[PDB]
Design a protein around this ligand. Structure first.
Ligand SMILES: Cc1cc2nc3c(=O)[nH]c(=O)nc-3n(C[C@H](O)[C@H](O)[C@H](O)COP(=O)(O)OP(=O)(O)OC[C@H]3O[C@@H](n4cnc5c(N)ncnc54)[C@H](O)[C@@H]3O)c2cc1C
Ligand SMILES: Cc1cc2nc3c(=O)[nH]c(=O)nc-3n(C[C@H](O)[C@H](O)[C@H](O)COP(=O)(O)OP(=O)(O)OC[C@H]3O[C@@H](n4cnc5c(N)ncnc54)[C@H](O)[C@@H]3O)c2cc1C
Lengths: 340, 340
């Protein structure tokens, strides 16, 4: 069985790995190749701070709630493993700030020690009147991506750096299954009007005294669109930009001032952190994740395409669940081809 | 009036500050001076991780508990100040690990969001069956000591590097008040059998992914003597060593291993942290802080000695309370001399 994964973000690589470690002992020639226009440093996944946190309001598909849950329980089970540091995996507590009282998140019992802000804490943030506090996990995209490769490489998963033009192209050269993990750019290979870029821009700053994450929430601004501060391993992420439809992969000097002024108002100590660099990325926005099979009707017969894109602003949070699912689906294919 | 302060550690400097700001206006010639044998870079106060947290069991003088309280609200109130970083001040949440269930601390409501660890959290630390979790503060002793220094230097307080041989020596040469902040070395000036060196050794290590302090408790070894992990700004502090009576200011190879071994067990990810520094220190251990006046009867008249030492292993946690008290005690000295 020749298997071609398109894309090398958290999704492609996490799906690649899963499919391997779950089916390599069962399929005799399980040949898995990764095709991607961009690698390790130049993906959206690298632009992610990697804070685990699904939306506030429930998802359109309750499957997703489990997927995130699955992912959290996985990473948490490994927070102490001797490899945690290569993964870029660590614990982080922090604040979720709100203007008015809002219902508990469905994930409340997933994070460690969930609870509500005690007045003295809100005192630290004059402009916010209510909020949560809990312990969570960070999985730095860059590190994680780097770690996934090593696992993948020693597993014989070959990487090629190319821009796939069509699903047929990849089919024409032997692919029995095509795992489709092409992120926001998925549209180029098959129309999907429901997919939109959630353009983001961030600032990496040096402020090692910040030990907590601090996410603001504002209805006049909308999801991911108010100041947030996520302490990384080597550097603190200053962010708060989400613009639908914007394809401009370029740091914007107007957005810069937004990030800076917003985060500085939040935490004035950040008023003397040294700016280390700025980045722009595209959230794979979709009413829900396309995580399903499709019989792609090739030449004489047809070839199986598993879709795995549209994880919007919470890829790292959900990725592992999705991978395990993309693997189950893979396994179904194997059954139907009676090559199980 | 002529004030001499002996001690350039947290107590000396912080006391001098309180005295000055409270009494520069009311005294015609308020002339404060600091004599110290060691300064800002080479004090015990410089080995202190700086974690705010008093003992678990209530102290002697219940007035102490009030002092830690004053200190904690003072610091919390400046956590977002423009100069919080020069102070070396920041917020930090973390764990406290106990073997069996055990009654809550007296301070439970001074810290932020105090609560008990939920079973899952306790599953992170297999060796511990019960504990607390709260947000707290660090005042890195070094950064703080440097900040005070500038404050004092700005306020015209003069510094002299000298070994004071006796109270009288300093009285003979002109002092009207002698604020005694000689910490653990207080004995060499006035017999105090209760004062004792609580020797400790720390390990500064480079593990920026750690966002929480982890303190352990084990009665078989008592306070300060079980693995602890305190994330500073530049580096993580490893520790767990308390030795009463030991006056060796010298890093110990057996102590090292003990620290390193103890801490790697607590949190395995430390196993791959690079070791940056190693340092010994003496907690000024006493049944209780001595914070009181004393008329030292010299020649014609006598001079006034405010004693302020014996803060053991919680000097930073408590410094501001004590400092305010010594300034109050200094106040009366004033009224009685008809200088109010
Ligand atoms: C600023 C910002 C902050 C974020 N913070 C977080 C956070 O804290 N937590 C969190 O969970 N998520 C966060 N996210 C979002 C999350 O990181 C993404 O949803 C996640 O990375 C999704 O994985 P992916 O689908 O992006 O893989 P991608 O990064 O989209 O993978 C794309 C790869 O596939 C290749 N490709 C695409 N089309 C083709 C083609 N036709 N031929 C060949 N190759 C192709 C590309 O070249 C690229 O190499 C953040 C996002 C942004 C922008
Ligand atoms: C390893 C370790 C970790 C610690 N961690 C913490 C923590 O996390 N939180 C916390 O709150 N506390 C902690 N402590 C304790 C705390 O650091 C001390 O209790 C605190 O610094 C007390 O202030 P001080 O008396 O030490 O001032 P000192 O450090 O004692 O100042 C001494 C100065 O006085 C001078 N001096 C002394 N005698 C004379 C003399 N006769 N003539 C002239 N000069 C003299 C000395 O040369 C020196 O300059 C820790 C202690 C240790 C050892």
């Amino acid at each position: 069985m020749r298997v071609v994964v398109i894309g090398a973000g958290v999704i492609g690589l996490s799906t690649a790995l899963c499919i391997h470690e779950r089916y390599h002992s069962v399929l005799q020639p399980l040949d898995i190749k990764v095709y991607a226009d961009r690698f390790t440093p130049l993906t959206t996944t690298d632009v992610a701070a990697g804070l685990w946190q699904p939306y506030l309001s429930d998802p359109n598909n309750p499957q997703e709630a489990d997927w995130s849950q699955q992912t959290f329980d996985y990473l948490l089970s490994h927070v102490h493993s001797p490899n945690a540091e290569n993964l870029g995996l660590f614990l982080i507590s922090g604040y979720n700030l709100f203007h008015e009282a809002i219902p508990d998140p469905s994930w409340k019992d997933t994070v460690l020690g969930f609870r509500k802000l005690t007045p003295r804490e809100l005192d630290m943030f004059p402009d916010y009147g209510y909020g949560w506090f809990h312990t969570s996990l960070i999985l730095e995209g860059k590190n994680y991506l780097q770690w996934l490769t090593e696992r993948l490489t020693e597993r014989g998963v070959k990487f090629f750096q190319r821009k796939v033009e069509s699903f047929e192209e990849v089919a024409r050269e032997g692919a029995d299954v095509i795992v489709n993990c092409t992120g926001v750019w998925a549209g180029a290979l098959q129309r999907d009007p429901l997919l939109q870029p959630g353009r983001g821009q961030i600032m990496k700053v040096d402020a090692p005294w910040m030990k907590h994450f601090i996410l603001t929430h504002d209805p006049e601004r909308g999801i991911y669109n108010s100041p947030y501060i996520i302490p990384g391993t080597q550097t603190v992420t200053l962010g708060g930009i989400f613009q639908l439809g914007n394809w401009s992969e370029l740091n914007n000097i107007q957005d810069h001032n937004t990030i800076w002024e917003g985060c500085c108002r939040l935490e004035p100590t950040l008023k003397n952190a040294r700016i280390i660099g700025e980045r722009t990325g595209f959230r794979p926005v979709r009413p829900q994740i396309r995580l399903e099979r499709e019989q792609l009707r090739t030449g004489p017969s047809n070839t199986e395409v598993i879709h795995n894109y549209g994880h919007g602003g919470y890829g790292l949070t959900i990725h592992w669940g999705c991978a395990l699912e993309a693997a189950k689906l893979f396994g179904r294919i194997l059954e139907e081809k009676k090559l199980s």
